[PDB]
């Protein structure tokens, strides 16, 4: 039911700074949160969201995750002079104090739970805050990195006391470690953390040893915390993406979260003089979008840091154009994970094994386009439409006497003639995004869509198709990738042919979306992908398949459907239109027999494809 999509902010948390020497934090500005907003002003996205006032966040919040008495300590800021306020900084690793800090710092607390609770109450599908000072570094009783209070802290316990939440996930792609998270719910299973970070073998800040992968949880929450350690400096998207299909994903989906919460720190981004990484500001246009089926959409965005004011903006910009459901741009240049990646990819993989054995090894402004069968009329939502035109049919019965001399059903050349004009409307025309057609049969109609498809034209097409026997596709020019779901061997490498049997089905198909589906489709960077399902169900999984593969081809999906299916139909379309995509319920585990099946698939094809690689290559 939810809408819209939050943008929390206020000019007032610009108005401190850091006023003596300080070589430490004088990367942290004010700019940094005129800058993002100023570049969200500029793009035309910050007035598309609905913009929430900033409130400050009561004592009793704030006693949720810190203690009276440095709540108290810090409370007495606002009357010291710059005599007294050096001085109690230096109490602090790396972080400034200001007449203002306290201040600003309960509304950047106020401004995340406004944020959660708008989001917690339907009033819109997700949202992002853009704050300052940031959270993650501060902890119960200290301020420390630029933090004084632990904002996505708060909105985790806060969400937990309020809406009776069992299940948070907590994504902090900043690139230093969010220890204060990691501290508040190292004892709490029900706040799932997850924080990728420089480390370098702890020689970056703030050199913890908690900080790595051997960190996972005390107590009864073991296996709710996830380091994933970057030990060299310059990662490219790849090397995100990779952590995201291989560790952070899979463990999402069998988590299930009630909601999610981003701890969005843009140091993470090429070009931020802390981060040293090198990946492009879009990478987070799919780190968010990538998010999106979990938690139904309900998302908070919580700014952290990013201290390139010029990298900055682009990358916020990246983020909220997601949340609006905006297409994702394409990535090029993908591939296999950089070597020390993989390292610490496979070394987390390893002792998470044994919490989520997903993990274990073998020893060693119209977007969708919708054409029903005719006389079908349906309810469709705000960003949908239905059907030809001369020059359209002038070429359907071309192509009918050159390859189809022996087909004279007209219901399957108004197929055909709506297939060619929804490929012209997205390819050519730039109007409309996504489409579904529904189909009498497949060997025309998947034969036409696609041939017509290249020429639009298509450099590469990615092809998804749930059924079994073959298809009138040809995978050997290399400008065309086949994913298939039946129930078969492989030989070539541009195929990947999956069979399942069963009652783990829909969690198996999630294992192997994540691990195998999506890392191909994201390295093969496709112009169209092309969606077939035949009328012999099971689609616990679709909506999040048809929501999933939309960071590809910047969305440009198309889904021949055989048969009409109320019920599919309806549920396709909704995850083409943006929708908010129903969960799983928490994701049981596969069996065996289609585990097996998929790591014989992933050794056949990670030589090519190298995204499908989580752990280092052994040098022959
Ligand atoms: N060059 C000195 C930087 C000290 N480290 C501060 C950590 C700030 C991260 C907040 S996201
Ligand atoms: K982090
Ligand atoms: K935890
Ligand atoms: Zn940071």
Redesign the pocket.
């Known amino acids: 039911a939810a809408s819209g999509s939050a943008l929390i902010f206020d000019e007032e948390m610009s108005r401190y700074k850091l006023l003596w020497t300080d070589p430490a934090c004088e990367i942290e500005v004010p700019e940094r949160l005129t800058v993002s907003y100023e570049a969200l002003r500029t793009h035309g996205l910050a007035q598309r969201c609905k913009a929430v006032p900033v409130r400050q966040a009561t004592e009793q919040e704030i006693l949720l995750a810190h203690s009276e008495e440095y709540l108290e300590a810090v409370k007495q800021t606002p009357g010291m002079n710059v005599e007294e306020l050096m001085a109690f900084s230096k109490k602090y690793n790396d972080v400034y104090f200001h007449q203002n800090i306290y201040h600003c710092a309960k509304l950047a607390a106020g401004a995340t739970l406004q944020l959660v609770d708008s989001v917690m109450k339907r009033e819109v599908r997700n949202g992002m805050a853009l704050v300052r000072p940031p959270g993650h570094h501060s902890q119960r009783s200290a301020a420390n990195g630029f933090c004084v209070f632990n904002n996505v802290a708060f909105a985790a316990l806060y969400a937990k006391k309020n809406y009776n939440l069992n299940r948070i996930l907590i994504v902090d792609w900043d690139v230093h470690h969010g220890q204060g998270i ?1 501290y508040c ?2 004892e ?2 029900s ?3 997850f924080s990728w970070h420089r480390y370098e073998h702890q020689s970056f800040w703030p050199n913890l040893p908690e900080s790595d992968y051997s960190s996972v ?1 005390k107590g009864k ?1 073991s296996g ?2 996830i380091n994933l350690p970057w030990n060299k400096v310059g990662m490219t998207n790849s090397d995100y993406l990779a952590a995201f299909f291989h560790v952070l994903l899979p463990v999402a989906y069998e988590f299930d979260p009630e909601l999610v919460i981003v701890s969005a720190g843009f140091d993470s981004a090429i070009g931020d003089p802390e981060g040293e990484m090198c990946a492009l500001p879009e990478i987070f246009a799919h780190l968010t979008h990538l998010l999106m089926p979990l938690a139904a959409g309900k998302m908070c965005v919580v700014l952290e840091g990013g201290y390139n004011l010029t990298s900055l903006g682009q990358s916020v910009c990246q983020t909220v154009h997601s949340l609006l459901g905006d297409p994702t741009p394409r990535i090029s240049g993908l591939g296999t994970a950089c070597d020390s990646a993989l390292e610490s990819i496979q070394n987390v993989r390893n002792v998470q094994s044994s919490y989520w054995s997903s993990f274990k090894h073998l020893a060693q402004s119209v977007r969708t386009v919708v054409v029903p069968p005719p006389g079908v009329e349906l309810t469709l939502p705000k960003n949908c439409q239905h059907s030809i035109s001369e020059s359209t049919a002038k070429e359907v019965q071309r192509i009918r006497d050159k390859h189809f001399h022996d087909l004279t059903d007209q219901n399957i050349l108004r197929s055909l003639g709506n297939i060619i004009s929804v490929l012209d409307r997205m390819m050519r025309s730039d109007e409309v995004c996504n489409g579904c057609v529904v189909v009498s049969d497949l060997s025309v109609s998947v034969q036409c869509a696609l041939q017509h498809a290249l020429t639009e034209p298509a450099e590469r097409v990615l092809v998804v198709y749930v059924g079994d026997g073959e298809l009138p596709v040809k995978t050997n020019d290399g400008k065309v990738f086949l994913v298939q779901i039946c129930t078969t061997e492989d030989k070539c490498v541009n195929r990947l042919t999956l069979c399942l049997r069963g009652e783990s089905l829909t969690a198996g198909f999630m294992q192997a979306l994540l691990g195998l589906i999506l890392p191909v489709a994201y390295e093969f960077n496709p112009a169209l992908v092309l969606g077939i399902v035949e009328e012999t169900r099971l689609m616990r999984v679709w909506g999040h398949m048809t929501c999933l593969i939309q960071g590809l081809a910047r969305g440009r999906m198309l889904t021949l459907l055989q048969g009409y299916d109320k019920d599919l139909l309806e549920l396709t379309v909704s995850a083409l239109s943006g929708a908010s995509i129903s969960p799983l319920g928490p994701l049981r585990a596969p069996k065996p027999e289609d585990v097996e099946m998929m790591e014989k698939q992933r050794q056949r094809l990670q030589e090519r494809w190298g995204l499908l690689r989580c752990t280092v290559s052994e040098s022959w």
Do not use: K, S, T
Request: overall charge negative.
């Open positions: 990691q719910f190292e709490d299973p706040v799932l953390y949880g929450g709710f915390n």
